[PDB]
Amino acid sequence: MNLYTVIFINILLSLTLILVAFWLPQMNLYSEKANPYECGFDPTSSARLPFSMKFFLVAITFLLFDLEIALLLPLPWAIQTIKTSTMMIMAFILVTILSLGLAYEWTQKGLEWTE
Amino acid sequence: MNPITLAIIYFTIFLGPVITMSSTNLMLMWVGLEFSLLAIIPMLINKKNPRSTEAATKYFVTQATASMIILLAIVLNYKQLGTWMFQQQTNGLILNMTLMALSMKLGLAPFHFWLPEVTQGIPLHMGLILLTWQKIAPLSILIQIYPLLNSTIILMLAITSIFMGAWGGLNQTQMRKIMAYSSIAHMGWMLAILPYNPSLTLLNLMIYIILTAPMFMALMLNNSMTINSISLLWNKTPAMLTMISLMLLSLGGLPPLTGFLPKWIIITELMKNNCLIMATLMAMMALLNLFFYTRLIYSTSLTMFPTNNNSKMMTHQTKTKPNLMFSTLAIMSTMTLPLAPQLIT
Amino acid sequence: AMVKRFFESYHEVPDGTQCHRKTYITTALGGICGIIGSAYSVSLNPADSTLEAVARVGRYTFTAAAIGAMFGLTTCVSAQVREKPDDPLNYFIGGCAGGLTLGARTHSYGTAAMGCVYMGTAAALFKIGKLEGWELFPTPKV
Amino acid sequence: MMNGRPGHEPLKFLPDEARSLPPPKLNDPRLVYMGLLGYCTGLMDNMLRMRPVMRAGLHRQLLFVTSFVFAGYFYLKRQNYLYAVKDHDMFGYIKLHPEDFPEKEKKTYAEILEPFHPVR
Amino acid sequence: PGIVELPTLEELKVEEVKVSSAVLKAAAHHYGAQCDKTNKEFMLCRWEEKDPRRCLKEGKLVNGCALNFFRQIKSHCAEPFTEYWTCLDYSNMQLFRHCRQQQAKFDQCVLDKLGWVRPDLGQLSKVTKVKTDRPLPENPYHSRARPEPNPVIEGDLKPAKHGTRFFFWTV
Amino acid sequence: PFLDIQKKLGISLDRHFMFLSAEQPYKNAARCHAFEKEWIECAHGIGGTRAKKECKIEFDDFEECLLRYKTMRRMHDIKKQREKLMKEGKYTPPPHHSGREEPRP
Amino acid sequence: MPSTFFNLTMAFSLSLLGTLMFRSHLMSTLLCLEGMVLSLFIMTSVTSLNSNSMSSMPIPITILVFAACEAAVGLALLVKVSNTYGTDYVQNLNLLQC
Amino acid sequence: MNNYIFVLSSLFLVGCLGLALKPSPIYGGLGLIVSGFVGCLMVLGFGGSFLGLMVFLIYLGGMLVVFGYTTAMATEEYPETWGSNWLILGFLVLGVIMEVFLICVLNYYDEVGVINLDGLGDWLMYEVDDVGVMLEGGIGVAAMYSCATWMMVVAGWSLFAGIFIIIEITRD
Numbered sequence A: 001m002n003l004y005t006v007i008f009i010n011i012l013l014s015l016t017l018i019l020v021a022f023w024l025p026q027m028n029l030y031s032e033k034a035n036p037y038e039c040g041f042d043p044t045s046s047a048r049l050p051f052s053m054k055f056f057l058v059a060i061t062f063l064l065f066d067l068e069i070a071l072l073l074p075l076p077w078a079i080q081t082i083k084t085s086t087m088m089i090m091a092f093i094l095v096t097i098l099s100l101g102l103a104y105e106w107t108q109k110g111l112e113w114t115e
Numbered sequence B: 001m002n003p004i005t006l007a008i009i010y011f012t013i014f015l016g017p018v019i020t021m022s023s024t025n026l027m028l029m030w031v032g033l034e035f036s037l038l039a040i041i042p043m044l045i046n047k048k049n050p051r052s053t054e055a056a057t058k059y060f061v062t063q064a065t066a067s068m069i070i071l072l073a074i075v076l077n078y079k080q081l082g083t084w085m086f087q088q089q090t091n092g093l094i095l096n097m098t099l100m101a102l103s104m105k106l107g108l109a110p111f112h113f114w115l116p117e118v119t120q121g122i123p124l125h126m127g128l129i130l131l132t133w134q135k136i137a138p139l140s141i142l143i144q145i146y147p148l149l150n151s152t153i154i155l156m157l158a159i160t161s162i163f164m165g166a167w168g169g170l171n172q173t174q175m176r177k178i179m180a181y182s183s184i185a186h187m188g189w190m191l192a193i194l195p196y197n198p199s200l201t202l203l204n205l206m207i208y209i210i211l212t213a214p215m216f217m218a219l220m221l222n223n224s225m226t227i228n229s230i231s232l233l234w235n236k237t238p239a240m241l242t243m244i245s246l247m248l249l250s251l252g253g254l255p256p257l258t259g260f261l262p263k264w265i266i267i268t269e270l271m272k273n274n275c276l277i278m279a280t281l282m283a284m285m286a287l288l289n290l291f292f293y294t295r296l297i298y299s300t301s302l303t304m305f306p307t308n309n310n311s312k313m314m315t316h317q318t319k320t321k322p323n324l325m326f327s328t329l330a331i332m333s334t335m336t337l338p339l340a341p342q343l344i345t
Numbered sequence C: 001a002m003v004k005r006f007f008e009s010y011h012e013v014p015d016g017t018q019c020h021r022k023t024y025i026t027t028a029l030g031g032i033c034g035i036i037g038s039a040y041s042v043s044l045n046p047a048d049s050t051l052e053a054v055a056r057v058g059r060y061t062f063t064a065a066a067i068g069a070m071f072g073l074t075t076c077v078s079a080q081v082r083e084k085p086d087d088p089l090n091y092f093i094g095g096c097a098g099g100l101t102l103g104a105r106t107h108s109y110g111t112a113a114m115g116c117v118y119m120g121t122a123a124a125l126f127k128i129g130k131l132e133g134w135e136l137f138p139t140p141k142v
Numbered sequence D: 001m002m003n004g005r006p007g008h009e010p011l012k013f014l015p016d017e018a019r020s021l022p023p024p025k026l027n028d029p030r031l032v033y034m035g036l037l038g039y040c041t042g043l044m045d046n047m048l049r050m051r052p053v054m055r056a057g058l059h060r061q062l063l064f065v066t067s068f069v070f071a072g073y074f075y076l077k078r079q080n081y082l083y084a085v086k087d088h089d090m091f092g093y094i095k096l097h098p099e100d101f102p103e104k105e106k107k108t109y110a111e112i113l114e115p116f117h118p119v120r
Numbered sequence E: 001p002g003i004v005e006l007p008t009l010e011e012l013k014v015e016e017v018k019v020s021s022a023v024l025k026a027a028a029h030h031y032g033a034q035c036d037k038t039n040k041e042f043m044l045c046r047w048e049e050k051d052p053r054r055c056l057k058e059g060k061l062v063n064g065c066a067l068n069f070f071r072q073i074k075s076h077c078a079e080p081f082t083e084y085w086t087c088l089d090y091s092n093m094q095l096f097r098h099c100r101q102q103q104a105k106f107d108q109c110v111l112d113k114l115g116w117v118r119p120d121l122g123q124l125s126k127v128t129k130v131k132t133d134r135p136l137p138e139n140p141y142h143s144r145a146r147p148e149p150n151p152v153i154e155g156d157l158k159p160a161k162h163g164t165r166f167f168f169w170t171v
Numbered sequence F: 001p002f003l004d005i006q007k008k009l010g011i012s013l014d015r016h017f018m019f020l021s022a023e024q025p026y027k028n029a030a031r032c033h034a035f036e037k038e039w040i041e042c043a044h045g046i047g048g049t050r051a052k053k054e055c056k057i058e059f060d061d062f063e064e065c066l067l068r069y070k071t072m073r074r075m076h077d078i079k080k081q082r083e084k085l086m087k088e089g090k091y092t093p094p095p096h097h098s099g100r101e102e103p104r105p
Numbered sequence G: 001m002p003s004t005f006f007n008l009t010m011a012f013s014l015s016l017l018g019t020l021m022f023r024s025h026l027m028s029t030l031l032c033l034e035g036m037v038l039s040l041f042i043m044t045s046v047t048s049l050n051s052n053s054m055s056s057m058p059i060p061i062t063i064l065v066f067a068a069c070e071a072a073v074g075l076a077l078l079v080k081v082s083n084t085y086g087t088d089y090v091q092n093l094n095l096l097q098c
Numbered sequence H: 001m002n003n004y005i006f007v008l009s010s011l012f013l014v015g016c017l018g019l020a021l022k023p024s025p026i027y028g029g030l031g032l033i034v035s036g037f038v039g040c041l042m043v044l045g046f047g048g049s050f051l052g053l054m055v056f057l058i059y060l061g062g063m064l065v066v067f068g069y070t071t072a073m074a075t076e077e078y079p080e081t082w083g084s085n086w087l088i089l090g091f092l093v094l095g096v097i098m099e100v101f102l103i104c105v106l107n108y109y110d111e112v113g114v115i116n117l118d119g120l121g122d123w124l125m126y127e128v129d130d131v132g133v134m135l136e137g138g139i140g141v142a143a144m145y146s147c148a149t150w151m152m153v154v155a156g157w158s159l160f161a162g163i164f165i166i167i168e169i170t171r172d
């Protein structure tokens, strides 16, 4: 109950500041004020057009590496096992293959951003 | 691909079905099917053109969707019975979605529409893997739960596949599309008999595979993608005309070839179970396959189509193919009906 | 469900009697086949607009329902007039009448003629199956 | 159908109880035909490689013939065993259930009245 | 479809050991040494019988043993024991390591007054054997008789009679 | 499995966590351990077809233990009959069902 | 438990319906697959907790591991589709009709 | 508090409805983040802890990659929201109405079957080992390192092979 209570208060405080910030100040809306900023000149296109991602391969590698750490985060419970040798070999093998995967991608220039 | 990539990817292609066939747990069976999907995609798209990209994408979205439905059934059964295998007490709807999703993975009609398109978009040697090695894992699952399956859904899938495999293959001029429709028709036969006698499902799978493998090797010899391309065989590799003709007639199930055996035995077993009407319909529409195979035989070995001047330069060159696996499979796929009693029991 | 029972009511009484109820049952069955076929048609061969898709769904369903009505009516009237409840010929006449209807709706004597023979033979064989206890989807026995 | 039977070893090509069966003759007609197929495979392989069909690679031809016969002999032994097991189970089941398989006392044609259908 | 038999509320009346968790933990090591025989009898009943209704008599002896143990502390060592469990009760986890000074004063008291030796590390976690007049339950799961296995077919293998018998094949 | 490699080699890659009654960490029995143990043991050695009829008692009990359809319905009936009587003013819950119990121990 | 599992199965069915009823973006469909994965994860996790089946808790994690591999391949394919056509629209992926 | 888990599973259902309607993947990505959070709460509510926090953490990472991919390869001039198209908005409202209807009707016919609105909160936790120590979900997951090592072998192989797969798919 307590965790729910404090997070609601955190939400409540943030939303109150937003309401104050939008209803206290004097406003003056006109078109030139609300147009998008681009260093004093008009944009030549939408900001909604495609924006190329040069690190796209690192990005999807990160998806796999993020499930690798998910497999590592039970380790504090796993070190309590009687089967210490089995746990240790499994953890060593898991870390080593992930290193080999990173090493391969590194030597394939998979960490280099595209030009 | 460099050697390390080939070894890892081909090993994973091999591994997935082995996991599926050896697993007691349904989750590990699903894991095996997951390995197959993931590992085969880079091979499908290896050549990297718009058609191969289309083929790999269509294959991915179909297979991943079917994999989720299979997982739903496994999870629902785990909820119902607290176990990781389907039982006699598993809810029938759970089993019917497993059958639906596996049949979509296999490309059985009416979940077939993807398969002729994907086969058309990929290299011949990948079509070979798609239509042979990749069938084994989903079929292996079905064979395990054959007493639990609904005969009504199976026969409807089976007759639909035979009908659409037949009419589908009738309109094709592309070889890769003809093989895909041949796959669908033969899967219809494999499935029809699975709930009655799963050993005859395996007999049909084996005979289909040893017919399809050398047929793909024959296409691979000159990279014949169309009827008009294969019709130049008489000028490029005439020695293959005898075995292609017999393999095509064997695929069509004409006696006294080995390919008559699966249709013959499945009819016998279906009628031991009073499945007379379906067996009649299946056998009658399977003749339509023999029609488009015959038209193919007409354009390769029984007539000689016009050739071209550049083909003379080909006759100056020596070839190093086919390997001797072609001759072994070609002979055993056509001339082994005398040994029929050793193949069914 | 009760929907299944509504279709078992076709065989509750011998042919040639209760021809009104049997005509509703076969009209309903024909309509369902038209709805299924229409669904695959519009999904796989989409129309140029929604009003054409809906127009095509109605064309298929009513045509399929008409075929089922003519088959069910003609079969029962034929058995009533000929006083032969258990004759597969009554079903052949009904299946031919259904086949003629299909040709009349699609403006084709070849479909009428080809429809009559194929649908007559299929319907006659259905009656023989009902009499001789054939199973369409037998469960495994051996 | 037989896979779950009592005393079934997993992935055993030739169970030890199969050694009570008479082995196939080495000139069994099915084994002679296997060797003939191996010979055809060798000739077809020569044809496909544009070699003299009968003359080229007699060492390759001999290996084709011997492999087919060698494999066929052991496969034939396994197939003999599976058929023998099927009969062993069928007859054994018949003995445990004599009420489902009664001996039907048949009547002579002196008592049976078959209908006569004149041909004319 | 049978009636579940429940003991009456009167059968479930006992003298409660109604002291707090810090009091129990402070005395837990001496309690385990002093009331072991009664406590191990009750736990053997529970694991053998798998039914709390079959162990009510032994459960009541557990409560009486615990009350006789705490009355010995009350009559001889009340003040050393109170100083100890009150210090132990301060910690959010009731840790032993924050009150070693008060534990030693209590331990010395129950040693001189009552001769009670605190068990060593590892001793209370041992599996021990206990003697009981209670019979061993014969079918604690109330399981039915297992269905009889299929009759096995015996004899030596013979060849298939007339070979495979597959249509027209002779062998 | 389709290929019984694990049985042939006498290993266990996935045979030993197949059902509720299997080994659990720190010997924490799963729900319905005793019912699933009884159902598996009744069925052993007789095959699935016979087990469906002849172990029907064990399966129903295990099914009830795990899914608890009957337990939920029985409590729904008692609580529904109590609601009817209280509205009619014919039943008054005791003090211990109203939050004024004499807590044990 | 009863009502929670009904709602979770409905959540899977909606995600599958989303997968089966394409709009234009291939990426929107890839998100629907992740929705089915998410539903199945919770269903497996809640079942293991409700039955106190601690030996089955590895399985939900393995569901996410292979889903990550499936999602990574899906995104890798989507890069290829976008490179060919400049969008991820599925109507362009129609060359294999002939 | 007796409605707590039903409310959460009801929120989860709406999130998947929003995803199924497939607005711009920007809002699809947001829909999965909220559903992931709601899904974490449900796992927590049933006594979970590690599993709930894992799936939220994994999906937080997963949707960040999808955000990056969306801005490069799945964007249009006018990205669609749930309100932008009247047709999508109507099926959002109709879908929510059909949820209330489906739960209402199923409650009437069975009353204790799939929906048991009278008994909500009485059948969340079934059994709990009151005096236990080693019971948290992380212990169960950790069996991959000792008792279920095959599960970890296959999981590790798929991530390792995935690196080689995605490198092959993405090279030109």
Ligand SMILES: CCCCCCCCCCCCO[C@@H]1O[C@H](CO)[C@@H](O[C@H]2O[C@H](CO)[C@@H](O)[C@H](O)[C@H]2O)[C@H](O)[C@H]1O
Pocket: A084, A085, A086, A088, A089, A092, A093, A096, A097
């Ligand atoms: C290709 C990937 C390669 C990377 C993976 C390599 C993994 C190989 C690991 C080698 C190290 C194993 O190290 C091994 O540790 C275990 C405990 O963990 C030690 O084991 C020792 O302590 C344990 C307690 O833990 C005792 O029960 C055991 O009797 C004793 O041998 C072994 O003496 C040591 O050999």
Ligand SMILES: CCCCCCCCCCCCO[C@@H]1O[C@H](CO)[C@@H](O[C@H]2O[C@H](CO)[C@@H](O)[C@H](O)[C@H]2O)[C@H](O)[C@H]1O
Pocket: A107, A108, B002, B003, B004, B006, B007
């Ligand atoms: C295909 C099945 C049979 C083969 C089985 C698989 C084992 C193959 C063993 C030989 C593999 C060695 O293959 C070798 O891989 C390394 C990966 O580090 C590549 O090399 C890579 O790293 C080295 C670093 O100095 C550089 O060449 C470069 O950065 C990159 O290409 C080599 O270009 C390739 O030649």
Ligand SMILES: CCCCCCCCCCCCO[C@@H]1O[C@H](CO)[C@@H](O[C@H]2O[C@H](CO)[C@@H](O)[C@H](O)[C@H]2O)[C@H](O)[C@H]1O
Pocket: B233, B234, B235, B238, B239, B241, B242, B245, B256, B301, B302
């Ligand atoms: C149950 C009975 C079994 C019947 C067995 C069937 C036998 C095979 C029938 C298919 C015949 C193969 O097809 C036949 O191939 C041979 C080469 O081998 C061709 O042979 C001819 O043309 C080729 C070039 O095309 C020349 O190189 C060759 O010298 C010439 O004889 C025939 O023109 C063709 O018709």
Ligand SMILES: CCCCCCCCCCCCO[C@@H]1O[C@H](CO)[C@@H](O[C@H]2O[C@H](CO)[C@@H](O)[C@H](O)[C@H]2O)[C@H](O)[C@H]1O
Pocket: C006, C007, C008, C009, C010, C011, C025, C026, C029, C067, C068, C071, C094, C095, C098, C099, C119, C120, C122, C123, C126
């Ligand atoms: C236009 C000609 C068409 C030729 C095709 C064959 C036509 C014959 C089929 C229609 C005959 C009457 O319709 C047929 O009878 C009734 C309808 O109430 C149902 O009859 C059957 O129902 C179920 C099958 O689900 C059986 O278990 C039941 O024993 C039997 O009564 C069938 O579902 C329907 O097929």
Ligand SMILES: CCCCCCCCCCCCO[C@@H]1O[C@H](CO)[C@@H](O[C@H]2O[C@H](CO)[C@@H](O)[C@H](O)[C@H]2O)[C@H](O)[C@H]1O
Pocket: C100, C101, C103, C104, C105, C106, C107, C108, C109, C112
């Ligand atoms: C017991 C016997 C009962 C007999 C009645 C049942 C049989 C029904 C036969 C239906 C015949 C098809 O119906 C017939 O189709 C032709 C096709 O040229 C169409 O005929 C009409 O339109 C077509 C083009 O649309 C023109 O080319 C033609 O000159 C004109 O007559 C009509 O639609 C109808 O005259």
Ligand SMILES: CCCCCCCCCCCCO[C@@H]1O[C@H](CO)[C@@H](O[C@H]2O[C@H](CO)[C@@H](O)[C@H](O)[C@H]2O)[C@H](O)[C@H]1O
Pocket: B274, B276, B280, C132, C133, C134, C135
């Ligand atoms: C051109 C298309 C037609 C192809 C013709 C196919 C071959 C000829 C079909 C003959 C029809 C078989 O006729 C049918 O046979 C079956 C199978 O024995 C038997 O029928 C019966 O079989 C068994 C009893 O043995 C019953 O359990 C079953 O329910 C019932 O159908 C009857 O004898 C007859 O109803």
Ligand SMILES: CCCCCCCCCCCCO[C@@H]1O[C@H](CO)[C@@H](O[C@H]2O[C@H](CO)[C@@H](O)[C@H](O)[C@H]2O)[C@H](O)[C@H]1O
Pocket: F079, F083, H002, H003, H006, H007, H010, H011, H117, H118, H119, H120, H121, H122
């Ligand atoms: C997106 C958000 C969706 C919100 C969904 C709706 C949330 C509200 C849930 C309403 C469902 C029923 O919610 C509430 O259930 C409890 C059980 O816990 C019932 O419980 C109470 O009333 C019923 C009889 O009326 C009896 O069980 C008993 O007298 C008492 O426990 C409440 O009467 C009912 O109002």
Ligand SMILES: CCCCCCCCCCCCO[C@@H]1O[C@H](CO)[C@@H](O[C@H]2O[C@H](CO)[C@@H](O)[C@H](O)[C@H]2O)[C@H](O)[C@H]1O
Pocket: F011, F012, F013, F016, F023, H146, H147, H148, H149, H150, H153
């Ligand atoms: C072709 C690719 C595959 C080859 C690569 C994989 C090699 C295998 C490595 C994984 C080995 C797993 O090895 C397997 O471990 C489990 C525990 O996890 C052991 O399991 C053992 O302990 C468990 C603990 O609960 C008992 O319940 C079980 O009854 C017992 O067999 C198996 O006896 C052992 O066979």
